[model samples]
Target chain A: GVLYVGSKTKEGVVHGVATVAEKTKEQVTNVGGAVVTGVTAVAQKTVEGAGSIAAATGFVK
Target chain B: GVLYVGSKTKEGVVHGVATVAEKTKEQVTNVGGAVVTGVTAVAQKTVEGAGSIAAATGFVK
Candidate 1:
């Protein structure tokens, strides 16, 4: 139904790393759920990519 | 606990594009940690609606 990413410090400070590209159940099922998996796949790359970038800068742990 | 997106070049070729709906976290708490500053709100629009579509259109940038 939804997806999210980011880091939160012990201080309760949240860092919304990235938003899950939205899609409707109908839309996803329409494509036989291919789009669902597709979007999620992309999301993985983006999050991981951003994570790497963040780690390089010591942004997230 | 996980999320991502796509795009890779320079011969690295890491075009995953999506994958985060697969969550095993007990709960998606603290729903306001934008991976970046002033970016957390975007997740609301994304998972809530179809914000992922916007990101696909480069709206996230």
Candidate 2:
């Protein structure tokens, strides 16, 4: 289910970060229809060597 | 317009990183001068999985 998108910060603060997959709390309440929470997550990295050094000097080619 | 910081290199090679935004090209420039570029960005990741295990148990705590 290659999906790890997140959202929910208009101050309600429900940040569903990544790296906690294996999704099963009844399949995250049947695809997040509600009734699941609490799991501060983390995992992301390398920004591909800062985007290949900003696309090798084009500053983001 | 949160403006993340980054710089190029004589060994630096672009380190300015952060979630990108919708900044437009040639923003009607002429305000302060020094200008322009694109956005090949990424949301940065966790380092909590350090060399063969935790460097301090949190991997990168």
Candidate 3:
């Protein structure tokens, strides 16, 4: 019950190319930008010891 | 066409009272107690782990 076909709008959704840090670019619209760029799915985390904070922090590598 | 009953137009929205995490959540959160929390994943190809784990590792004998 919520979908679209575009017309002219964006406060988000540009995600690409790198480096916009804390504001706008994801697809070229941002009266106040807020932040939007374009494409970048980079990802990766942990703890340790000998008790329990994730089995003493081991397998999360 | 993503239109809600409060006036506006976009590809994202909120409802009766909920969330989608909205966006941006690699981790950075704290309040009233100067705290923070977050971890990573993607074992399908990324368990992006092992980072930061010591600021108060000992002292409370």
Candidate 4:
């Protein structure tokens, strides 16, 4: 179920942009699924940078 | 259409972190095309984990 693929950027002190690879259609079925689908939408978090590393803040296991 | 690539982790659950590869320009164009673009853009669901599994939700092909 491949659904979406895109990018993002956090908002804070040092903002950055990140992209979304392959996501499941089911995982992203409605509003707030994963992408910002409308102008009504608002920025949520402050993206720092790209790429994922061990012990990252945004992406953790 | 290379848009973006990054990583993500399933909600505060236990799945893991997954990284996104380069995407297409068309694949990631407008809202919801992919990635958590803006604040109006909300975190829809809890990512079960990282990586796209054969059987996932948000993404469907």
Best by TM-score: 4
C-alpha RMSD (angstroms) for model 3: 17.2
Among all candidates shown, the one with the greatest DockQ: 4
lDDT of 2 by residue, B2-61 (tens): 323232212211221122213333211111111111122223332223322111111111
Candidate models: Cα lDDT each: 0.24, 0.22, 0.22, 0.29
Ranking by TM-score: 4, 2, 3, 1
Give model 1's TM-score for chain A to 2 decimal places: 0.15
Q: Summarize candidate 3's per-residue lDDT along A1-61 as a digit string, tens digits.
A: 4422223333424322122223222222111101112222112112222322211211121
Report the Cα lDDT for residue A12, model 4. 16
In angstroms, the error of model 1 at B18 is 17
Q: State the TM-score of the second chain for every model.
A: 0.14, 0.15, 0.16, 0.18
DockQ list for all candidates? 0.05, 0.04, 0.08, 0.09
Model 4, position A13, has a per-residue lDDT of 25
Q: For residues A5-61, what per-residue lDDT tens digits would candidate 4 score against the true structure? A: 342433312111333545333111122223333322333322234322122112111
Give the distance in Å from residue B51's predicted Cα in candidate 4 to where it truly belongs: 6.7
Fnat, model 1, is 0.03
Give me the runs in candidate 3 sitting further than 4 Å from their true place. Answer: A1-9, A13-42, A45-61, B1-10, B13-61
TM-score of chain A of 3: 0.14
Which of candidates 2 and 4 is the stronger one according to lDDT?
Answer: 4
